Structure formats: C-alpha cells, structure tokens
C-alpha cells in the first residue's frame, strides 16, 4: 500500500495511531520484514493526487 511519510513508523507491532487502528493492524507476535522507500516521483501530481 501507500502511506504518508511520518506514518511509516506506525507500521510496527504494538503501535497505536490512526493507521495502526483503522486501516492496518499488525499482530503482536509478528515475524517477517517491512520494506518502505520514498516514491515521490511516481505518486505525486502538481494538481494533487
């Protein structure tokens, strides 16, 4: 998916916030990896996406 810049830290087990509660919840006993990279060049419109 695509999220805001400061919300990338909300994608973690045990976190609290708007994204971690109403959009995507990670289990406490989570295993695996998360990969997040800036994509300002492909998901940005001057008029507004």
């Amino acid at each position: 998916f695509v999220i805001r810049g400061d919300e990338v830290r909300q994608i973690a087990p045990g976190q609290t916030g708007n994204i971690a509660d109403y959009n995507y919840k990670l289990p406490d006993d989570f295993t695996g990896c998360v990969i997040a990279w800036n994509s300002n060049k492909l998901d940005s419109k001057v008029s507004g996406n």
Partner: protein, 49 residues
C-alpha cells in the same frame, strides 16, 4: 517453657510473611505493578519487564 513449640509457629508465619513481602519488589524493573507495565509501555520492552 514452651519456646520449642512457639518457635515452629514463629518460623512458619515469618516465612509466609517474607514471601508476601517479596511479592512487592521491583526486581530491577521500572515498576512492580504488572498492569501498569502493560498500560504505560509498548509490548516490545513490556515483555522484557
């Protein structure tokens, strides 16, 4: 005269009291209240505590 009989009771009660007192020690954690540890801190180091 009955110190021999009294000492058994005095030892048992004192040991039980010592166990109850040891129940309320922080043991190196930030707090000795368990639900406080749950609520105040996130799971990552709450698990360690």
């Amino acid at each position: 005269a009955l110190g021999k009989l009294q000492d058994v009771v005095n030892h048992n009660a004192q040991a039980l009291n010592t166990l109850v007192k040891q129940l309320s020690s922080k043991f190196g954690a930030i707090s000795s209240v368990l639900n406080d540890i749950f609520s105040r801190l996130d799971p990552p180091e709450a698990e360690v505590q």
